[PDB]
From a paper:
Here, we modified ACER3 (residues 1–244) with the BRIL soluble module (thermostabilized apocytochrome b562RIL from Escherichia coli) fused to its C-terminus and showed that this fusion is biologically active; it hydrolyzes C18:1 ceramide substrate in a preferred manner over C18:0 ceramide in detergent micelles. In fact, the crystal structure revealed that it possesses seven alpha-helices forming a 7TM architecture with opposite N- and C-terminus domains. The N-terminus (1–34), devoid of secondary structure, is packed against the bottom of the TM bundle (1–3, 6, and 7) and forms a spiral-like motif in which resides a Ca2+ ion. The crystal structure uncovers a disulfide bond formed between C21 and C196 connecting the N-terminus to TM6. The ACER3 7TM domain contains a large hook-shaped intramembrane pocket directly accessible to the lipid leaflet through two openings between the TM5 and the TM6. Directly below this area appeared a large electron density in the calculated 2Fo–Fc map as well as in the (unbiased) polder OMIT map23 that we tentatively modeled as a mono-olein. At the bottom of the intramembrane pocket, we unambiguously identified a Zn2+ ion. This Zn2+ is coordinated by three His residues (H81TM2, H217TM7, and H221TM7) and a water molecule forming hydrogen bonds with S77TM2 and D92TM3. Interestingly, the crystallographic water molecule that bridges S77TM2, D92TM3, and the Zn2+ ion appears to be suitably placed for a nucleophilic attack on the ceramide carbonyl, suggesting a general acid–base catalytic mechanism in which D92TM3 acts as a proton acceptor/donor (similar to e.g., zinc-dependent proteases)24. The Ca2+ ion is coordinated by six oxygens from the D19 carboxylate (bidentate), the W20 backbone carbonyl, the E22 backbone carbonyl, the N24 side chain carbonyl, and the E33 carboxylate (monodentate).
Author numbering: 1 to 350
The structure:
């Protein structure tokens, strides 16, 4: 039949190349596709929280950029679903290509030396994103964007599969979980497109989730936004495991900072050295020294190695307490106590 249309237009007409299954300005006349708009908050709030945590912890620029790029994708989608115009449509679909390009760079540079740039991969991703954008603007076909975004996700999937199968099998739960929700989100994306029915919405209890659960494109933002967030976590974790210090590194850090305390002239050096010494002590306490490599981690010699570190950590905490109390000279003099306890309980096992 030919009844009344559910798309209750207000605040400008739809000039965008495509309009989703969600009824235009049905909940409120202020924003179009209400649930497709508000669902982008999980692609705005958590990635921004991840971006500020990354700058505070002093992480690599590419990991800060990856979190901010997802926020741009979220903000762009929030602007596109609200207005439903071609101008804001590009602000949503184009950053998806750029964010994925940043993610591809991070995933292929995870096992590279710190403070190094691969200009060959960087110029390839810039050239790819430039080619994709230029033709997408000229030929306004949305299917082309979906294909080019799909192959970027596919290359990102293969790298994540290679890492979990050959390098870090620990990231199986995180890596595969990210992948699955994303495919679950992509499944729901086609449910809203192909099975576009307002019947469920119309028949009953629209205010509850039954009315709301049928907005599968909104659930797509919820799942891909959580999925991309997970991927960044996965990417970050891959880098953290590679840049992670071993027992030999921690033992060197423990001793270098111990000599720093002995030769220190100001409070900041002593405090800094004790902080770095505590981090190295707790990390070396978990590890097995080369002389105990044959023995079990629960052996009496191993319990003695951990006991020596328990005394050392405690004495570092005592020295940090003195440093935090303004007793610089007393905290500085703790170095000989720390030197004695390592010589009497730890040094014999290395
Ligand atoms: C496994 C990690 C993948 C990282 C992807 C990074 C991009 C951000 C993720 C999701 C944005 C969703 C909201 C934007 C959705 C816009 C609709 C569109 O054109 O989608 C194209 C796809 O349906 C083609 O499959
Ligand atoms: Ca719509
Ligand atoms: Mg670096
Ligand atoms: Mg001074
Ligand atoms: Na329309
Ligand atoms: Na659902
Ligand atoms: Na080493
Ligand atoms: Zn969308």
């Amino acid at each position: 039949f030919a009844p009344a249309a559910d798309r209750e237009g207000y605040w400008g007409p739809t000039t965008s190349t495509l309009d989703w299954c969600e009824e235009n300005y049905s909940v409120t006349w202020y924003i179009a596709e209400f649930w497709n708009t508000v669902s982008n908050l999980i692609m705005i709030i958590p990635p921004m929280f991840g971006a500020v945590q990354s700058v505070r912890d002093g992480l690599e620029k590419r990991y800060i950029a990856s979190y901010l790029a997802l926020t741009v994708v979220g903000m762009g989608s929030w602007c596109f679903h609200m207005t439903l115009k071609y101008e804001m449509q590009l602000l949503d679909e184009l950053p998806m290509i750029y964010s994925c390009c940043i993610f591809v760079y991070c995933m292929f540079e995870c096992f590279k030396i710190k403070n190094s740039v691969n200009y060959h991969l960087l110029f390839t991703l810039v050239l790819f994103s430039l080619i994709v954008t230029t033709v997408y603007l000229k030929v306004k076909e949305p299917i082309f964007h979906q294909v080019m975004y799909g192959m970027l996700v596919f290359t990102l999937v293969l790298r994540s599969i290679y890492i979990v199968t050959w390098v870090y099998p620990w990231l199986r739960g995180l890596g595969y979980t990210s992948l699955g929700i994303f495919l679950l989100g992509f499944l729901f994306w086609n449910i809203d497109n192909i099975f576009c029915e307002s019947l469920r919405n119309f028949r009953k209890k629209v205010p509850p989730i039954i009315g709301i659960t049928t907005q599968f494109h909104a659930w797509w933002h919820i799942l891909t936004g959580l999925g991309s967030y997970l991927h960044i976590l996965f990417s970050l974790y891959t880098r953290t495991l590679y840049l992670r210090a071993d027992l030999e590194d921690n033992w060197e850090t423990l001793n270098d900072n111990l000599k720093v305390i002995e030769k220190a002239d100001n409070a900041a050096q002593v405090k800094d050295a004790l902080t770095k010494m505590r981090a190295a002590a707790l990390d070396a306490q978990k590890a097995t020294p080369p002389k105990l490599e044959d023995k079990s981690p629960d052996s009496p010699e191993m319990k003695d190695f951990r006991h020596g570190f328990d005394i050392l950590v405690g004495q570092i905490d005592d020295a940090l307490k003195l440093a935090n109390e303004g007793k610089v000279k007393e905290a500085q003099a703790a170095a000989e106590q720390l030197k004695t306890t390592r010589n009497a309980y730890i040094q014999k096992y290395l």
